[PDB]
mmCIF file of all heavy atoms in Angstrom:
data_model
loop_
_atom_site.group_PDB
_atom_site.id
_atom_site.type_symbol
_atom_site.label_atom_id
_atom_site.label_comp_id
_atom_site.label_asym_id
_atom_site.label_seq_id
_atom_site.Cartn_x
_atom_site.Cartn_y
_atom_site.Cartn_z
ATOM 1 N N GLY A 1 123.792 141.008 119.362
ATOM 2 C CA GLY A 1 123.159 141.821 118.377
ATOM 3 C C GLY A 1 124.009 142.946 117.746
ATOM 4 O O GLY A 1 123.498 143.847 117.129
ATOM 5 N N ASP A 2 125.366 142.861 117.849
ATOM 6 C CA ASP A 2 126.266 143.813 117.280
ATOM 7 C C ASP A 2 126.147 143.713 115.769
ATOM 8 O O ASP A 2 126.378 144.646 115.047
ATOM 9 C CB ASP A 2 127.656 143.664 117.784
ATOM 10 C CG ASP A 2 127.881 144.188 119.143
ATOM 11 O OD1 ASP A 2 127.042 145.050 119.581
ATOM 12 O OD2 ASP A 2 128.833 143.785 119.746
ATOM 13 N N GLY A 3 126.047 142.519 115.187
ATOM 14 C CA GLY A 3 125.967 142.334 113.771
ATOM 15 C C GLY A 3 125.895 140.832 113.456
ATOM 16 O O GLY A 3 125.696 139.995 114.331
ATOM 17 N N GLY A 4 126.112 140.538 112.149
ATOM 18 C CA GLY A 4 126.235 139.168 111.698
ATOM 19 C C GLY A 4 127.315 138.373 112.374
ATOM 20 O O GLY A 4 128.280 139.007 112.967
ATOM 21 N N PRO A 5 127.210 136.967 112.352
ATOM 22 C CA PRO A 5 128.178 136.156 113.038
ATOM 23 C C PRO A 5 129.458 135.979 112.238
ATOM 24 O O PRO A 5 129.751 135.019 111.553
ATOM 25 C CB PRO A 5 127.437 134.794 113.204
ATOM 26 C CG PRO A 5 126.571 134.766 112.025
ATOM 27 C CD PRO A 5 126.131 136.113 111.689
ATOM 28 N N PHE A 6 130.311 136.993 112.417
ATOM 29 C CA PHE A 6 131.636 137.043 111.704
ATOM 30 C C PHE A 6 132.640 137.730 112.640
ATOM 31 O O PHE A 6 132.281 138.817 113.172
ATOM 32 C CB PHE A 6 131.504 137.744 110.334
ATOM 33 C CG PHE A 6 130.429 137.168 109.470
ATOM 34 C CD1 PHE A 6 129.111 137.644 109.471
ATOM 35 C CD2 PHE A 6 130.683 136.083 108.633
ATOM 36 C CE1 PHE A 6 128.128 137.160 108.695
ATOM 37 C CE2 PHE A 6 129.684 135.575 107.814
ATOM 38 C CZ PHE A 6 128.422 136.085 107.845
ATOM 39 N N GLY A 7 133.787 137.114 112.720
ATOM 40 C CA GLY A 7 134.822 137.597 113.667
ATOM 41 C C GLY A 7 136.207 137.665 112.973
ATOM 42 O O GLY A 7 136.475 136.987 111.999
ATOM 43 N N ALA A 8 137.004 138.495 113.553
ATOM 44 C CA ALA A 8 138.343 138.689 112.988
ATOM 45 C C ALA A 8 139.279 139.014 114.233
ATOM 46 O O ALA A 8 138.984 139.686 115.152
ATOM 47 C CB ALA A 8 138.388 139.878 112.051
ATOM 48 N N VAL A 9 140.564 138.395 114.132
ATOM 49 C CA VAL A 9 141.550 138.640 115.131
ATOM 50 C C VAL A 9 142.838 139.006 114.423
ATOM 51 O O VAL A 9 143.266 138.345 113.403
ATOM 52 C CB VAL A 9 141.745 137.283 115.975
ATOM 53 C CG1 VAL A 9 142.895 137.530 116.999
ATOM 54 C CG2 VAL A 9 140.478 136.928 116.653
ATOM 55 N N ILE A 10 143.488 140.076 114.856
ATOM 56 C CA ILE A 10 144.801 140.488 114.347
ATOM 57 C C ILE A 10 145.853 140.186 115.381
ATOM 58 O O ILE A 10 145.665 140.487 116.625
ATOM 59 C CB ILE A 10 144.788 141.978 114.016
ATOM 60 C CG1 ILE A 10 143.952 142.232 112.712
ATOM 61 C CG2 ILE A 10 146.171 142.530 113.814
ATOM 62 C CD1 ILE A 10 143.712 143.681 112.385
ATOM 63 N N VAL A 11 146.969 139.551 114.973
ATOM 64 C CA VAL A 11 147.959 139.039 115.847
ATOM 65 C C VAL A 11 149.407 139.605 115.426
ATOM 66 O O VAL A 11 149.647 139.816 114.283
ATOM 67 C CB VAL A 11 147.960 137.484 115.853
ATOM 68 C CG1 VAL A 11 149.172 136.908 116.529
ATOM 69 C CG2 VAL A 11 146.678 137.025 116.495
ATOM 70 N N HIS A 12 150.215 139.754 116.437
ATOM 71 C CA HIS A 12 151.605 140.123 116.186
ATOM 72 C C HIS A 12 152.477 139.214 117.090
ATOM 73 O O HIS A 12 152.387 139.332 118.339
ATOM 74 C CB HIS A 12 151.907 141.598 116.440
ATOM 75 C CG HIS A 12 153.356 141.899 116.467
ATOM 76 N ND1 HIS A 12 154.113 142.027 117.527
ATOM 77 C CD2 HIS A 12 154.153 142.147 115.406
ATOM 78 C CE1 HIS A 12 155.387 142.337 117.134
ATOM 79 N NE2 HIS A 12 155.458 142.304 115.885
ATOM 80 N N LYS A 13 153.261 138.337 116.480
ATOM 81 C CA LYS A 13 154.224 137.487 117.227
ATOM 82 C C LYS A 13 153.527 136.807 118.395
ATOM 83 O O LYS A 13 153.929 136.866 119.534
ATOM 84 C CB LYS A 13 155.402 138.276 117.742
ATOM 85 N N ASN A 14 152.354 136.076 118.073
ATOM 86 C CA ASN A 14 151.662 135.327 119.060
ATOM 87 C C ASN A 14 150.874 136.156 120.053
ATOM 88 O O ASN A 14 150.390 135.627 121.040
ATOM 89 C CB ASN A 14 152.530 134.221 119.675
ATOM 90 C CG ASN A 14 151.865 132.936 119.751
ATOM 91 O OD1 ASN A 14 151.481 132.416 120.846
ATOM 92 N ND2 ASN A 14 151.706 132.267 118.623
ATOM 93 N N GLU A 15 150.890 137.497 119.885
ATOM 94 C CA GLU A 15 150.122 138.385 120.762
ATOM 95 C C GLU A 15 149.000 138.979 120.040
ATOM 96 O O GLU A 15 149.123 139.505 118.899
ATOM 97 C CB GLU A 15 151.112 139.448 121.302
ATOM 98 N N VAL A 16 147.801 138.924 120.661
ATOM 99 C CA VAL A 16 146.545 139.439 119.960
ATOM 100 C C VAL A 16 146.594 140.997 120.161
ATOM 101 O O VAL A 16 146.771 141.529 121.203
ATOM 102 C CB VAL A 16 145.299 138.919 120.658
ATOM 103 C CG1 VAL A 16 144.070 139.559 120.140
ATOM 104 C CG2 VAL A 16 145.235 137.417 120.433
ATOM 105 N N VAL A 17 146.541 141.653 118.961
ATOM 106 C CA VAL A 17 146.468 143.127 118.945
ATOM 107 C C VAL A 17 145.052 143.567 118.950
ATOM 108 O O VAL A 17 144.719 144.655 119.573
ATOM 109 C CB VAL A 17 147.267 143.648 117.756
ATOM 110 C CG1 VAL A 17 147.126 145.121 117.649
ATOM 111 C CG2 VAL A 17 148.665 143.232 117.766
ATOM 112 N N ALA A 18 144.180 142.865 118.306
ATOM 113 C CA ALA A 18 142.750 143.232 118.235
ATOM 114 C C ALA A 18 141.930 141.986 117.976
ATOM 115 O O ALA A 18 142.271 141.100 117.243
ATOM 116 C CB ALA A 18 142.475 144.275 117.112
ATOM 117 N N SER A 19 140.773 141.947 118.681
ATOM 118 C CA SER A 19 139.860 140.831 118.544
ATOM 119 C C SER A 19 138.406 141.440 118.385
ATOM 120 O O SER A 19 137.974 142.041 119.354
ATOM 121 C CB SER A 19 139.906 139.899 119.771
ATOM 122 O OG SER A 19 139.211 138.722 119.574
ATOM 123 N N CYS A 20 137.799 141.285 117.261
ATOM 124 C CA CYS A 20 136.588 142.027 116.894
ATOM 125 C C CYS A 20 135.655 141.127 116.163
ATOM 126 O O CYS A 20 135.947 139.996 115.757
ATOM 127 C CB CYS A 20 137.015 143.275 116.069
ATOM 128 S SG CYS A 20 138.117 144.422 116.862
ATOM 129 N N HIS A 21 134.454 141.677 116.016
ATOM 130 C CA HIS A 21 133.378 140.984 115.212
ATOM 131 C C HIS A 21 132.639 142.091 114.397
ATOM 132 O O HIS A 21 132.928 143.279 114.544
ATOM 133 C CB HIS A 21 132.442 140.172 116.152
ATOM 134 C CG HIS A 21 131.913 140.976 117.276
ATOM 135 N ND1 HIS A 21 132.392 140.775 118.537
ATOM 136 C CD2 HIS A 21 130.955 141.956 117.345
ATOM 137 C CE1 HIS A 21 131.686 141.560 119.398
ATOM 138 N NE2 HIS A 21 130.854 142.275 118.632
ATOM 139 N N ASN A 22 131.709 141.611 113.574
ATOM 140 C CA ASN A 22 130.856 142.512 112.779
ATOM 141 C C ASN A 22 130.123 143.486 113.656
ATOM 142 O O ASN A 22 129.431 143.068 114.649
ATOM 143 C CB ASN A 22 129.974 141.727 111.821
ATOM 144 C CG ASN A 22 129.038 142.552 110.977
ATOM 145 O OD1 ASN A 22 128.311 143.412 111.522
ATOM 146 N ND2 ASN A 22 129.119 142.437 109.707
ATOM 147 N N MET A 23 130.182 144.792 113.446
ATOM 148 C CA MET A 23 129.493 145.817 114.136
ATOM 149 C C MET A 23 128.524 146.674 113.349
ATOM 150 O O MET A 23 128.255 147.794 113.732
ATOM 151 C CB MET A 23 130.601 146.728 114.796
ATOM 152 C CG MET A 23 131.603 146.050 115.677
ATOM 153 S SD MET A 23 130.905 145.293 117.131
ATOM 154 C CE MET A 23 130.661 146.765 118.136
ATOM 155 N N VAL A 24 128.047 146.113 112.234
ATOM 156 C CA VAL A 24 127.209 146.907 111.349
ATOM 157 C C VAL A 24 126.009 147.453 112.088
ATOM 158 O O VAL A 24 125.644 148.622 111.950
ATOM 159 C CB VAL A 24 126.814 146.056 110.178
ATOM 160 C CG1 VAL A 24 125.724 146.790 109.310
ATOM 161 C CG2 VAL A 24 127.977 145.620 109.266
ATOM 162 N N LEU A 25 125.302 146.612 112.919
ATOM 163 C CA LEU A 25 124.120 147.047 113.580
ATOM 164 C C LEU A 25 124.469 148.034 114.733
ATOM 165 O O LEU A 25 123.868 149.066 114.940
ATOM 166 C CB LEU A 25 123.356 145.896 114.138
ATOM 167 C CG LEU A 25 122.896 144.853 113.070
ATOM 168 C CD1 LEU A 25 122.114 143.700 113.778
ATOM 169 C CD2 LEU A 25 121.903 145.468 112.063
ATOM 170 N N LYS A 26 125.492 147.624 115.546
ATOM 171 C CA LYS A 26 125.848 148.478 116.696
ATOM 172 C C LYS A 26 126.275 149.828 116.313
ATOM 173 O O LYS A 26 125.947 150.826 116.887
ATOM 174 C CB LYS A 26 126.981 147.800 117.459
ATOM 175 C CG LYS A 26 127.389 148.483 118.718
ATOM 176 C CD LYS A 26 126.318 148.488 119.744
ATOM 177 C CE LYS A 26 126.816 149.053 121.093
ATOM 178 N NZ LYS A 26 125.733 148.942 122.157
ATOM 179 N N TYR A 27 127.065 149.959 115.177
ATOM 180 C CA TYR A 27 127.585 151.272 114.773
ATOM 181 C C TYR A 27 126.742 151.926 113.663
ATOM 182 O O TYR A 27 127.076 153.017 113.289
ATOM 183 C CB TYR A 27 129.092 151.108 114.248
ATOM 184 C CG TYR A 27 130.009 150.670 115.342
ATOM 185 C CD1 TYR A 27 131.330 150.235 114.951
ATOM 186 C CD2 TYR A 27 129.781 150.759 116.690
ATOM 187 C CE1 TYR A 27 132.256 149.844 115.892
ATOM 188 C CE2 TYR A 27 130.690 150.444 117.664
ATOM 189 C CZ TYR A 27 131.936 149.961 117.242
ATOM 190 O OH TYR A 27 132.882 149.612 118.218
ATOM 191 N N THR A 28 125.715 151.243 113.180
ATOM 192 C CA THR A 28 124.960 151.780 112.076
ATOM 193 C C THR A 28 125.907 152.118 110.893
ATOM 194 O O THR A 28 125.939 153.180 110.355
ATOM 195 C CB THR A 28 124.136 152.957 112.420
ATOM 196 O OG1 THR A 28 123.475 152.670 113.699
ATOM 197 C CG2 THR A 28 123.076 153.287 111.409
#
């Protein structure tokens, strides 16, 4: 229930820096 089904991953040299999804509902 954090938000809509949409995700994003930021990578540096095959290492994940951030792995996130939509947070519209969770964060208002």
Side-chain angles (χ1 to χ4, degrees), residues 1-12 14 16-28:
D2 283 341
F6 305 93
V9 179
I10 287 175
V11 170
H12 173 260
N14 225 249
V16 173
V17 178
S19 189
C20 300
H21 50 255
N22 180 301
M23 304 293 287
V24 173
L25 301 179
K26 182 66 172 183
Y27 293 167
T28 314

